[PDB]
Amino acid sequence: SKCRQWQSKIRRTNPIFCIRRASPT
């Protein structure tokens, strides 16, 4: 599902873009 996964992605991308400290690769 596009809509749900986009909403979940926004909430992930927020901290991952605002800080670079946490990078679990």
| Sign of the alpha-carbon dihedral angle for 16, 17, 23, 25 | positive
- Retrieve residue 25's tokens: 């690769």
8 Å CB contact between 14 and 21: no
What is the CA 7 to chain-centroid distance, rounded? 9
What whole-number distance in Å separates Cα of residue 2 and Cα of residue 10?
A: 12
What whole-number distance in Å separates Cα of residue 15 and Cα of residue 1?
A: 23
> What's the Cα-to-Cα distance from 1 to each of 4, 8, 24, rounded to whole Å?
6, 11, 25
The DSSP secondary-structure symbol of 6 reads: H
- Retrieve residue 3's tokens: 């809509």
What whole-number distance in Å separates Cα of residue 22 and Cα of residue 25?
A: 10
Give the technique used to solve this structure: NMR
- Retrieve residue 20's tokens: 């670079």
Helices (DSSP H) in 1-25: which residue ranges? 2-18
